[PDB]
Symmetry: D2
Subunit: 251 residues, 4 copies
């Protein structure tokens, strides 16, 4: 298995859940990976659970930390060579309607979910363009980038923003022949440690009126579409949306 | 003509261009209107050009000014009674790719285009719900909420955010029987004083590969869809996107 | 004050429900209207229920009847002058999954819902182009043109076809400066006497997991968006989709 | 290492271009494949160009031939065992505006592009449901299923129909726990020997206002997204649209 031969990936929020599975399958397919997270013990443990430092490393980083992004790229390049792949997966969710959202909650969520993805996409383009790397930026943009949820106001705003901002970046890279693709991935409900904690969460998500398959997905479901998008298999795919959601948005 | 009989509207950025035309046709159809802008002389002149203070007034307000939103609603209610209609039209545009966007430009544009629309939508729901007003929030969300533009990175992010955040608000209002609808309007290229200033802007916009009709629209084109959405004619329309773009997004 | 001054409209399936209301409000706004249906007694009574023969008439016509379309335009023009507006509203529904759809059912439904809309759109462009009529073709394309329904296989096919075929027509008309616009309207669930017939239908449709507003719409809800689209108010709107569905597609 | 271990696929229109590449990579990933086409000499040579008769065979079949579909499944099953994967790729194009489309052209194109996909999807569900095969129906639905083209009226109709009919099928299969997924793939412009035939076609397609990448794709670009969709890697993806188009629909 070598579908990501030679690739060097940054996966933000890669110590848990979806990000962890992305990192796992990236390494499996021959990529070198740096995962980020805010907790060192958890993060170091996550990295070692996947492989040795010759294929994967942890870097403590908050995606909303702009200066940290430059340090992150430098560290990754020093370890593994020129970055080829950026997965902007770090994010948080707040369960508040637009009406009930505090401005504090609004700004906090958008600093991670929107500013963080902007920082990673902007730097990704600057650092990876014109190097013949088959570079790929994969922005995590949710079913909440397509359809509203009354309890996810700020989250909806952030994911809609990521969805269309990514199209802008894809077009600019394509028109300028940067050899950088930008696409968005839109998970439906996926079983994560965060979902498991919230009592009744999986039950709500598994209703047929929400997810037609009647159950939520697993992190590997998102990892494999990310492998496709990071690989040269998808070299004609840019500015597009890839939805893996058990049928949620089809009805 | 009385399609907006009894309505009381706040139109942000209503002293110029699209916002001015919205205000104009709202008053024509029997609504009372408060328009906002950052310049008093321009704003007072704009208001008087449409009518007397018995139907329209100007309030100096920056849509990114959170505290000012509460003052704005209070002022409007004191003048004309309970607000029924909020048009979140204030916005700016920056001509930068994602790659070339400074963090300063990013934050400035989003403070107006995204935070401003959030502030108006959130307060709109709080102040207008459960009053049997046939309340309507109309968020201006652009063709740039649908398709990317390589030179409009931050603008794309803001308009994608507005697009989906508005769906969240619409759903919450519908599910809680608030008697508040929320919809988005998506203008294509429209002739405004801002477009006229930028040499070559209308020419670029009028190319058939951009706008199939081969010319840009006029502010009244957006005013009339806003009249429909503010009126009780559209009482079953919520969470939807209304595109007036000369065919831009159809190809 | 009339919003459809001078317009001459054909409304197919205009003797009942949504089509009847479209015809009704068209006449109210000053249009001359020919409504079609397959049943003469019902149809003649329907026309007279709206207005006199100087503003509305019934013509017996099956929208799947290609030769009848030329006859229909000729009859309408002889009565009221050059046609300016075509509302392709005739349609049928079959409650079958794709799996369970007979080829007979498939062909029957598509003959009306797809072929009929093609016949009306094709002839509409031919008959109305270059005459400076502010011509507008309004194709009825359903929430089922956006999202699937497991029990509406053939219907979904027909409405997806109408949705995108209409964009093709809109673009060709725009690029050729034909003075013809083409748009689609997408009703959610609407209360008609026919819906009243099917026991439990309205209750099912009004569930919040279907329609967030918790009730279904009325035919006038679709009539008023059609008035907008038929009027010169919408002269910059073409190739677009107008959804009136109580929030159905927003979640 | 094989990603399609145990799969048995029917690929219609599989003797040339996109279909040929899909068949080629399916066989590479361990699937047994039957390709169809209307020309025996071309088709038999095509099958042998990919592999031996133990992994790929040609069957002469017109996708609009309803009775032939049952024969096709029987033949495939006799050769390779129960079918697990159906790629509805057979199709034709007509370069006519809606206005200029003859009824003969309309019916001919829809008989293959729409009826053929219906026949294959309907029979696929009937033949593959409840067998625990990880079954996948992949319907080829084009960028022309998303956006209009003034010169592709009938084609647009057919591809819009396929787009939404496929969601209906996906939902029914999901809700009934059929172990069948249905998704659509949307190629942009792809270089084939047939495109090479039409002088100036590739140049037109490669204009930045059409394809932002400034070049068209290759059949393998569509093959690899189909491998993903056919594989159990995509077991949570259903009712979704996968666009591989060099940025065409992003602007
Ligand atoms: Mg009347
Ligand atoms: Mg939905
Ligand atoms: Mg091979
Ligand atoms: Mg486009």
């Amino acid at each position: 298995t070598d579908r990501l031969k030679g690739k060097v990936a940054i996966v933000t929020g890669g110590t848990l859940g979806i990000g962890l599975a992305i990192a796992d399958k990236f390494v499996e397919e021959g990529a070198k990976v740096v995962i980020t997270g805010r907790h060192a013990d958890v993060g170091e443990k996550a990295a070692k659970s996947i492989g040795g430092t010759d294929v994967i490393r942890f870097v403590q980083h908050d995606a909303s930390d702009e200066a940290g992004w430059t340090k992150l790229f430098d560290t990754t390049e020093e370890a593994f060579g020129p970055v080829t792949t950026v997965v902007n997966n770090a994010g948080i969710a707040v369960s508040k309607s637009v009406e009930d959202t505090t401005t504090e909650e609004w700004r906090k969520l958008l600093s991670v979910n929107l500013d963080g993805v902007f920082f990673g996409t902007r730097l990704g383009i600057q650092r990876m363009k014109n190097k013949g790397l088959g570079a790929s930026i994969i922005n995590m943009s949710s079913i909440s980038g397509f359809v509203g949820d009354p309890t996810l106001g700020a989250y909806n705003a952030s994911k809609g923003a990521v969805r269309i901002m990514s199209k802008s970046a894809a077009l600019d890279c394509a028109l300028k022949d940067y050899d950088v693709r930008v696409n968005t991935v839109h998970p439906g409900y996926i079983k994560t440690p965060l979902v498991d904690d919230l009592e009744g969460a999986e039950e709500m998500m598994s209703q047929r009126t929400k997810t037609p398959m009647g159950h939520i997905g697993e992190p590997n479901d998102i990892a494999w579409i990310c492998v496709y998008l990071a690989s040269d298999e998808s070299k004609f795919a840019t500015g597009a949306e890839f939805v893996v959601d058990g049928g949620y948005t089809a009805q």
